[PDB]
Amino acid sequence: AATSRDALPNTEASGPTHSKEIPALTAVETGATNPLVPSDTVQTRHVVQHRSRSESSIESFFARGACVTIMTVDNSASTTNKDKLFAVWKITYKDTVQLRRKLEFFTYSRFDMELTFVVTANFTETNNGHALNQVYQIMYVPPGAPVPEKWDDYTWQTSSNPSIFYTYGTAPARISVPYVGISNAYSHFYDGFSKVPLKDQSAALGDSLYGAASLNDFGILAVRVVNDHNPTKVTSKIRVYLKPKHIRVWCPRPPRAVAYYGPGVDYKDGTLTPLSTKDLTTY
Amino acid sequence: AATSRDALPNTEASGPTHSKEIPALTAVETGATNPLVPSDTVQTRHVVQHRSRSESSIESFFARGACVTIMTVDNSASTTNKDKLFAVWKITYKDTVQLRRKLEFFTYSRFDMELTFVVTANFTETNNGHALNQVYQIMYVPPGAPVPEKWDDYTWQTSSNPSIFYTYGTAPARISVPYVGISNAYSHFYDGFSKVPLKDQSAALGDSLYGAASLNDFGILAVRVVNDHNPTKVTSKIRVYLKPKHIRVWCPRPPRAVAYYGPGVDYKDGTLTPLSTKDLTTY
Amino acid sequence: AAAASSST
Amino acid sequence: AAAASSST
Amino acid sequence: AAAASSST
Amino acid sequence: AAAASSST
Amino acid sequence: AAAASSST
Amino acid sequence: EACGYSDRVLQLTLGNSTITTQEAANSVVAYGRWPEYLRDSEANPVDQPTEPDVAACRFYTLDTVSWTKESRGWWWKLPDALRDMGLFGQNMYYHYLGRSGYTVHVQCNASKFHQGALGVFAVPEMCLAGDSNTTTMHTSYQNANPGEKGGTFTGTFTPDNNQTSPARRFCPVDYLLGNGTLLGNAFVFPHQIINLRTNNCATLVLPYVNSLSIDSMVKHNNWGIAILPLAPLNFASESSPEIPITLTIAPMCCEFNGLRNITLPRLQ
Amino acid sequence: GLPVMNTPGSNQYLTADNFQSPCALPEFDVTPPIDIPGEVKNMMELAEIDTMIPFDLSATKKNTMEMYRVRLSDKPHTDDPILCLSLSPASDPRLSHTMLGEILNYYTHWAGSLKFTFLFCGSMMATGKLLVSYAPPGADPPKKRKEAMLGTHVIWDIGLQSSCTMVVPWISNTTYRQTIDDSFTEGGYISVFYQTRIVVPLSTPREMDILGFVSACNDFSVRLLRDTTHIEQKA
Amino acid sequence: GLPVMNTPGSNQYLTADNFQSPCALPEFDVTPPIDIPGEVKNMMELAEIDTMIPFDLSATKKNTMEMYRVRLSDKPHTDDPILCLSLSPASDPRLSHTMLGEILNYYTHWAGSLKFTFLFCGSMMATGKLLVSYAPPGADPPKKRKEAMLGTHVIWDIGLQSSCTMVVPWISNTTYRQTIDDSFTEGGYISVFYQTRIVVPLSTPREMDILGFVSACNDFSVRLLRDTTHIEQKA
Amino acid sequence: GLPVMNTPGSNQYLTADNFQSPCALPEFDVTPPIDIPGEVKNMMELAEIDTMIPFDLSAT
Amino acid sequence: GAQVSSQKVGAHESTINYTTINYYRDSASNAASKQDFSQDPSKFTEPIKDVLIKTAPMLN
Amino acid sequence: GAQVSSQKVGAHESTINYTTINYYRDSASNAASKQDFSQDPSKFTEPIKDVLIKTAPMLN
Amino acid sequence: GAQVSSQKVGAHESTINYTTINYYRDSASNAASKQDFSQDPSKFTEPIKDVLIKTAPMLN
Ligand SMILES: CCCCCCCCCCCCC/C=C\[C@H](O)[C@H](N)CO
Ligand SMILES: CCCCCCCCCCCCC/C=C\[C@H](O)[C@H](N)CO
Ligand SMILES: *C(=O)CCCCCCCCCCCCC
Ligand SMILES: *C(=O)CCCCCCCCCCCCC
Ligand SMILES: *C(=O)CCCCCCCCCCCCC
């Protein structure tokens, strides 16, 4: 019944002591933390406490859109060696580091996802030509569906895949997604393999990446400029902001202390000395 | 129970007097102000009063967005000696003078804050090139968080800092902020230091600015243009309008009579003669 | 509300 | 609601 | 209002 | 609705 | 309306 | 207890095995959850489970390791460390799916004149870091699963460089818990400390933990047991003291699904 | 979606508006108020407090402590003014920078009765009778006691009660006056005279000062909020 | 359509906002939750857990297992400090990377009482009495037991109960302190001393280690969410 | 007009959306349904029907 | 959750009302109600220990 | 279907409320309510089989 | 005329509802309710004149 925004416990007045109760002495070997409060070791006055833990609840901690990727597309004329540029991104929270670090305070999580898209464009050449307002198509291609090979091939029909058609200059685009895991929770960490190497069968076949589960978790986002190309070249970038809503988390972990090095827990040489010099008896 | 918009007291009819009650005579040495009304010293008629003090209530006095700063950013190509320009502003009400003067009628205050952002841009060169519509990012960096060093470094991910992504040409941006003070009220004036100079310890260490409390009160606003630069250069300005809503104030002060000179009460030479010539017996 | 909303 | 919606 | 708002 | 709409 | 508007 | 009983003296019995201890520092139940069988509401595979009970839910003692002044630490993974342990290992390899909890009993006695402190940590999904700086997530299954003998921490990251034919193994630096986080914070994980002046054992009761109700035990380890010297071994004045550490572990409420022929893993 | 039609005023920013807006720091734990002494609810509360008038803004006395002192003396009776003042609470140089004047320069319009209190700072042995006058606008501004006498006044007798208050009653054609010099809303003339004369014994100072204060009565109000000219930021 | 008027804030994107939005996968069959052990509801739950302090960040000891060990010995009594520490839970190098310190670097403000627990890792034959002190800010930081003694402290007697807890009570002028080094919101000084001395018999080690832990009390809270400086992505 | 504030997602086109829209043929006299045999309500009904497996996909 | 209040009517064309609804959870997001209270100036105009009667001598 | 709740009021100008209405069928579309519950840290701070009394010896 | 229904809640932060109002006269303008019914596959999986008992011989 205690809610995240209820006030914290009042300090109670406490006086001198001379007894056999020994709050201060304990034994951490047990694995427990001594639940002491100030009135246990000093004389306290009475204080009516108003502060609350409202902003440090799990929802409140993650209630922010965070940048997870930048996608680059353009709108130039497809020509024999170079093609009009559409973009493909494998959905993940690990291409950037800030939200990744926050989620990894925990082993497992559950949440609905809110994706917000910020789209910006500019002129790449010291031309003078112009371009009429661009419409962008953001298609979700789930694992198994035909990935697009050309800015204009049949896959962009999206008969079943969800697509967003974004008009440049309008408010940033936004959609919501349910908890889509094939597990009962997302695993921030997976201590295992997706393949059992079998003696009887050749080694090359038995093999797989450490800590990786399905090769293609959540599929990809494919973005394109729907407009046919202008003579003038315009490059656009799509920044994706992710926010976990209605989130639950389990099994706390120590935070990442050294620079991320890849999608796993690996650390690179020369990045392993985080703490700095400070002497034992120096305030 | 009397509300700011209730009508003021009626004038009551009063006639001739010849008595020992002496309303007119008083002694200001006491520190009090004589609470006289016209019927005390002249013969009054009866008047049903309709006027109210509705517009001079504390809320009504401050219920206006006021300009507190102008931030300049641009969108040019970052080159070996000069970089694309993003802006950093330390949040304060003292960079301009008008609202500062109004708040300083009082010693302490409490309020929610409404910030409105007006964004204007223009072409800096006698070019002819163009620029597609710009999106601006306004990030709040609270004291302690990584301040951005480059228009495009990792800090702009904003995983936890609040950011506003503003599209040019749309209605001015606006957000609200609660009372965020680490005190029970904001102090417009602080007669003290943030450091006790200790004999035993060297002077250089004991030192600090007069009237300044935490070196970094409320952190900073960092603004950037999200778009990659055009060949053509565009400069933009962000004007910030501040409005105190749901405000309370304590301990009235005489208003600032001479030009502000810095964040404190200091006054500069040659600005100290405000009043003008006018003879004692000249209407 | 009863009256209020007329219905047809 | 009854009161609340005034009607004329 | 009672009627109205149908609910399911 | 009665309650909920508070009125002043 | 009574039901519905739930209140907390 | 006026009639005798104490925190320091315990008897644990599972199956045909009994453990006694006269110098415990209580017991820990991870996240306050005792091991349990899979509930119908949470069940997923529809076939009748195999439940080995006393045949598999008993105490298996692994190989005794030795603690010295130069030890940096040891690690094990579950169920991997028990893969060859009697009828538990057999039920494990005959089935596609399996789940288990564990009672972990770490044993290390010494004397009133020795000193030192071992941190015993039970880590859910203990993914460790590899030895390579030119490729990631590349430790091999064989290298990742030491079985009963476990692995060890090092005080120094030393990158495998034979690019032609890579070591493909973990390189777990002790102060970073082998995973890029600081050891000082591993206490947020279920744990106990064996401080030689206070106790001679650590006992942890570990529930089945995962994001699935049941999973592949051969592909996936649910728990990591990490033992690190928080305070180094020291005795009287001998420059080279040594004392043994023995690990005894019991599977608890374990059940298996998806019976077929036995899995014969390539473990070398 | 619900059919809607954008009306004029859409997307504009009125600085005097009053709308809701999204909060940038959700669930922030607000520090509660404490009961600080001296809370103010209305700017007019401050206008009701007495503040000292800079009566003598003469060239050598202005912008100095002397400007607050009206010097009197035991000289023989005269019908000439001790001081003359226009009732332009926001614009007259002598009233414009008093706390009342200052608050009035944030508003375009004022209305109500005012009161002037004078404090005698001579010695206890000094005696005297003075006349304090208010003449509603429209005639020759008083220059002699004879004229001044004919309007609203108080004959102040100096004694134990150190000070004397004269109330300037709200007498106006318009319902509100402007906070600027303006003939249509002119307020009249305040002036002070010797009724008899200041008299002192021997061994006593023959010159002394009086001080003056202005404050608003409870029937006073202001409206149409505006920026002041009493501060600026040239560059 | 219904007449509407767009207000300021329209079409903006506040990253801290909280609106509804269309679902891209309608009628998706969501996999239900199971009852995974170890659920967390508030980040402060993690701050209440004890984590080990890297007290010795000296040049040769830092970023190694040694940094966690405070070495003591059976040497004769001295009033000099075993260790000195500033109460800056988020900014002091020794506390900044503890789990408490880490959570505090995602917030701008902190408040509440903290507790330091020390574990003696010497042999059972070793005895000793130590003094653990906390001095609220504003005076000379303690350098001798004599000074340290005058403030908040605990005299720890080494014996069967291996460990000892000292509570640092919330004593502040401000209602919240900043999560950065800052004089206005300075918190004071933690220091440890020998009360008597460590005493061992023969055949026993004369040097040994103590370990220290910090955790938050139930009255502790944090506010104003912010990005941390403890991780970055240079390029 | 009623004060309103456009939120993100405004003016976008999600192909999976579910909104109302104006009808281009108002008051059109719709031809009623008849009771055609073989109605389907869920694609899984079709998955429950037996279909023949091409077991031998050998080259010839 | 609608809140109905009355306007103090200035120039006229029964009481007239207006309606307010709060859309946000945080009270900081709320507009200003302007339904404010007045107090009496005593604490500033007459801060004296002994209550003053205006018809009697301030000093006696 | 409107849902009315109260705001925990920070700086003041009876209880104040705000109103919410869900426009979409999918609960994933819903905003976050922030009406969250707190729990006690026991399972992490005191995961020991035998309940601990802080005034008594942790080890006996 | 508002219509209130309940959402089948997926990942949680009582029953939650959403609200619908039809703005247009033509039912073709209405969004899709998704409140659909399932049927049993019999007419396709077992179109046989004589009811089948799965434990008994299909052919007797
Ligand atoms: C038109 C836009 C549609 C966008 C649809 C996105 C659907 C896919 C959601 C991605 C789910 C990612 C959740 C994050 C990662 C997992 O937590 C970890 N790898 C652990 O399982
Ligand atoms: C995305 C935009 C977020 C903007 C967040 C702004 C939060 C910080 C609010 C600044 C508070 C300033 C209040 C004014 C000053 C203090 O009154 C004086 N120095 C006295 O304490
Ligand atoms: C109390 O509010 C019950 C009556 C609700 C009336 C309709 C409200 C209009 C739409 C409000 C949606 C709120 C947006 C956050
Ligand atoms: C419960 O919701 C009954 C009251 C309805 C109040 C008016 C709702 C405002 C318009 C909502 C339309 C819903 C859009 C999908
Ligand atoms: C049944 O609908 C009675 C309740 C009406 C609630 C308010 C409706 C919101 C505005 C709807 C206008 C319809 C537009 C065609």
UniProtKB/Swiss-Prot annotation, chain H:
Highest taxon above the source species: Viruses
Subcellular location: Virion; Host cytoplasm
Subunit structure: Interacts with capsid protein VP1 and capsid protein VP3 in the mature capsid.
Biological function: Forms an icosahedral capsid of pseudo T=3 symmetry with capsid proteins VP1 and VP3. The capsid is 300 Angstroms in diameter, composed of 60 copies of each capsid protein and enclosing the viral positive strand RNA genome.
Protein's name according to its UniProt entry: Capsid protein VP2
Species per Swiss-Prot/TrEMBL record: Poliovirus type 1 (strain Mahoney)
Lineage of origin: Viruses, Riboviria, Orthornavirae, Pisuviricota, Pisoniviricetes
Residues of the full protein shown: 74 to 341 of 2209
Swiss-Prot record, chains L, M, N:
Effect on the protein of changing residue 2 to D: 50% loss of myristoylation. Severe reduction in specific infectivity
Transmembrane segments: none
Subcellular location, record wording: Virion
Lipid attachment in record (N-myristoyl glycine): 1
Highest taxon above the source species: Viruses
Consequence when changing residue 2 to H: No effect on myristoylation. Severe reduction in specific infectivity
Function recorded in the entry: Lies on the inner surface of the capsid shell. After binding to the host receptor, the capsid undergoes conformational changes. Capsid protein VP4 is released, Capsid protein VP1 N-terminus is externalized, and together, they shape a pore in the host membrane through which the viral genome is translocated into the host cell cytoplasm.
Self-association and partners: Interacts with capsid protein VP1 and capsid protein VP3.
Protein known as: Capsid protein VP4
Organism, scientific name: Poliovirus type 1 (strain Mahoney)
Parent-protein residues present: 2 to 69 of 2209
